[PDB]
Amino acid sequence: DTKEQRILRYVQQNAKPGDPQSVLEAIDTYCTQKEWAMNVGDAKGQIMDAVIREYSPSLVLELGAYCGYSAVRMARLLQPGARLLTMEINPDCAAITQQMLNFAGLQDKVTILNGASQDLIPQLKKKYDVDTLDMVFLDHWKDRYLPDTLLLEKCGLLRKGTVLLADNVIVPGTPDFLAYVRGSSSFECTHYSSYLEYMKVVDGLEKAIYQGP
Ligand SMILES: Nc1ncnc2c1ncn2[C@@H]1O[C@H](CSCC[C@H](N)C(=O)O)[C@@H](O)[C@H]1O
Ligand SMILES: O=c1[nH]cnc2c(O)cc(-c3ccc(F)cc3)cc12
Ligand SMILES: [Mg+2]
Numbered sequence: 001d002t003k004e005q006r007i008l009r010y011v012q013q014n015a016k017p018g019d020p021q022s023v024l025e026a027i028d029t030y031c032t033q034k035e036w037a038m039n040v041g042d043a044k045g046q047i048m049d050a051v052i053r054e055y056s057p058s059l060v061l062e063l064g065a066y067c068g069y070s071a072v073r074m075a076r077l078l079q080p081g082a083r084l085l086t087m088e089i090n091p092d093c094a095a096i097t098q099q100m101l102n103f104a105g106l107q108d109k110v111t112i113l114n115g116a117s118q119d120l121i122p123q124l125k126k127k128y129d130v131d132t133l134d135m136v137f138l139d140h141w142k143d144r145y146l147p148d149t150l151l152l153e154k155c156g157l158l159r160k161g162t163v164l165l166a167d168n169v170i171v172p173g174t175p176d177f178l179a180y181v182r183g184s185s186s187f188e189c190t191h192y193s194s195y196l197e198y199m200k201v202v203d204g205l206e207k208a209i210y211q212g213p
Helices: 003-014 020-033 041-055 069-075 091-104 117-123 142-154 169-173 175-183
Strands: 059-063 083-088 110-114 135-138 163-166 187-195 202-210
Touching: 003 020, 003 091, 020 041, 020 069, 020 091, 041 069, 041 135, 041 163, 041 187, 041 202, 059 069, 069 083, 069 091, 069 110, 083 091, 083 117, 091 110, 117 142, 135 142, 142 175, 169 175, 169 202, 175 187, 175 202
Parallel strands: 059 083, 059 135, 083 110, 135 163
Antiparallel strands: 163 202, 187 202
């Protein structure tokens, strides 16, 4: 019995099938009352919700699925026919995320890709039929944020206006990524100060909009 299985079982027993809002509320209750987990959370999730409503992305890429919290969160706001691709290196988590999405009834909007982002990003054009991305949510491992941003650019997956949204730019913190996008004339950056999920600890999200070569 892992924490991630306990979160899924809690949702299965305390949320309504096909209601993504009740799924998000059950995860937030479990993680506030029972066991902390590294879901984006309601505080930062509200900022994500606002950004998704602004840009109404047709194709979103998420790096780091975990239990599926942010996937449900973004997927429930996507337009009919819009898609999310989420990459998850840990197969146990991949499987928890698939079941989470199935229960929320969002499985037809989301494809979970198994593997390291650094292995799958180069496969997106040919293996997964991707042209360019409208939005990327970076929330996997801090040390991958900058190399994966640079890899997405190299692979031609970024276009003018592509919205990169990065979780945890303050805690655990992504200093090289932040220094890079903020100093780069290829990105327009905005910081959204907030709180670490379920904690009274300052964190934030960085929005960096790609401006071209
Ligand atoms: N290189 C990599 N590629 C893909 N996934 C990775 C990765 N390094 C870490 N991960 C995964 O990223 C996750 C971090 S937690 C992700 C939280 C999720 N976005 C949410 O808010 O609900 C973990 O599940 C971990 O397995
Ligand atoms: O490693 C992480 N990947 C993605 N998101 C995370 C996230 O939101 C929080 C944390 C985290 C924060 C504080 C702490 F004390 C221990 C872990 C890690 C990740
Ligand atoms: Mg995070």
